[PDB]
Design a protein around this nucleic acid. Structure first.
Ligand code: P1A
Lengths: 87, 236, 78
DNA sequence: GACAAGTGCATTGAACCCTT
DNA sequence: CAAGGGTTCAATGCACTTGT
């Protein structure tokens, strides 16, 4: 039945659960980078882009909104644990 | 996309030097006029400081390559017409946007209100507008020095070897072209810059007539305009 | 106005002989410049569109060729 | 181990520049 | 100006390493 594990954000092949959501490496990295920078994006379309492998590169605002909506947990990106006090 | 000859850079160098060499009147001269620890006070200072400005402007004009190649007749002709227009470039350089005032060589700030009192209330609103426009212009000391030079060999009525000067000028005009062509990518905007600058020429002509009318509307108010100035600006 | 003949993304004009996007232009340039050869990890018939063109470099390059991109049009590095 | 979080760095492509 | 060569470099995403 499950022929391909799907990224809940874009529909690309998921690599596992990242920040509590089944996502590809692309969306994992995008989400982590967006959170660590506290980036604020501005959609230059209609604030309602459907995410796929094409649009994910085109609209950062809608991709980030989709990451959150899917259940990616921003508090889980470099939390204040012992490992972070390290780096 | 070329650089500049040796002459050119020697001149630019040279001009940038004389410019700082003459921006202000000597410490003694400055000290002598500014001595002192009633509408004749702002008036005395403004007029007295102007006589120093003109002097500096004149000496700078002679430290110019090609100037001594001019007939004494023409030299007094060019100098006589440039005196008031360069003095304009120089009030721009001492303008302070924060206070909208002009700063005299004694570090004092003169406001539109001071020029009122001294009866120069006519010349100030326009002189200060030109300053705001020269401000946002944001020019470097090369421009200013080159520009100055140019103004001096600017074609004037009464000229004997008119064609001569035109070239003595074509040089500085040319050097400026080059220096702008290097300072930025010899791209489109390269002209836009060269143009706005050459535009300063025409505005400086309007502020020149105003200075004259002020000298006139001052002789008429029976107010001794220094003979030195009355003479150099052909104030009847 | 045109579409990339390789992937269907919005073309930015003709490049190396064909109507093509900046993506396929840039990809073909880098391939030829470096003289790279790719290997398909499937059956050399992978989908190359605006969505998944980046999945197979071999199939993307072969599709640039089939569409009419010319290796000779790629100049020496400047 | 196997997974998920964090990292290194080669590749992508939108936005420029250059010459005809 | 436009086209079609060029280049750039922040963002991206594949492969990796680290921690449990
Ligand atoms: C009719 C005539 C008297 C009027 C001229 C007036 O309108 C002007 C243009 O407003 C005059 C008045 C005084 C003035 O000569 C100056 C005083 C300084 O202290 C300095 C002396 C010297 O460093 C100059 O390089 C710049 C400056 C700021 C000049 C510029 C021109 C000024 C500001």
């Amino acid at each position: 039945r499950q022929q391909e594990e799907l990224c809940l954000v874009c529909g690309d092949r998921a690599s596992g659960y990242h920040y509590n959501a089944l996502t590809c490496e692309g969306c994992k990295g995008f989400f982590r980078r967006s959170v660590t920078k506290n980036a604020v994006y501005i959609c230059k379309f209609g604030h309602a882009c459907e995410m796929d492998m094409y649009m994910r590169r085109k609209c950062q605002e809608c991709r980030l909104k989709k990451c959150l909506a899917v259940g990616m947990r921003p508090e889980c990106v470099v939390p204040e644990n012992q490992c972070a006090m390290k780096r | 996309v070329p650089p500049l000859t040796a002459n050119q850079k020697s001149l630019i160098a040279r001009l940038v030097w004389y410019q700082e060499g003459y921006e202000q009147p000597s410490e003694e001269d400055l000290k002598r006029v500014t001595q002192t620890w009633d509408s004749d006070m702002p008036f005395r200072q403004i007029t007295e400081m102007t006589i120093l400005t003109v002097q500096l402007i004149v000496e700078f004009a002679k430290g110019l390559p090609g100037f001594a190649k001019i007939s004494q007749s023409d030299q007094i002709t060019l100098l006589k017409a440039c005196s008031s227009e360069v003095m304009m470039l120089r009030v721009a350089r001492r303008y302070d946007a924060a206070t909208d005032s002009v700063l005299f060589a004694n570090n004092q700030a003169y406001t539109r209100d001071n020029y009122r009192k001294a009866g120069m209330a006519y010349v100030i609103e326009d002189l200060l507008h030109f300053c705001r426009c020269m401000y946002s212009m944001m020019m470097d000391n090369v421009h200013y020095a080159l520009l100055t030079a140019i103004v001096i060999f600017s074609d004037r009525p009464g000229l004997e070897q008119p064609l001569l000067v035109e070239e003595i000028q074509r040089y500085y005009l040319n050097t400026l072209r080059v220096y702008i062509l290097n300072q930025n990518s010899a791209s489109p905007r390269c002209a836009v810059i060269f143009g706005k600058i050459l535009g300063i020429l025409t505005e400086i002509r309007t502020l020149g007539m105003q200075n004259s009318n002020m000298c006139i509307s001052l002789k008429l108010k029976n107010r001794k305009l220094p003979p030195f100035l009355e003479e150099i600006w052909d104030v009847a | 106005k045109h579409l990339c003949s390789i992937c269907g993304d919005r073309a930015s004009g003709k490049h190396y002989g064909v109507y093509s996007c900046e993506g396929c232009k840039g990809f073909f340039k880098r391939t030829v410049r470096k003289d790279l050869t790719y290997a398909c990890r499937e059956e050399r018939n992978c989908i190359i569109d605006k969505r998944q063109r980046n999945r197979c470099q071999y199939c993307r390059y072969q599709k640039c060729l089939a569409c009419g991109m010319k290796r000779e049009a790629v100049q020496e590095e400047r």
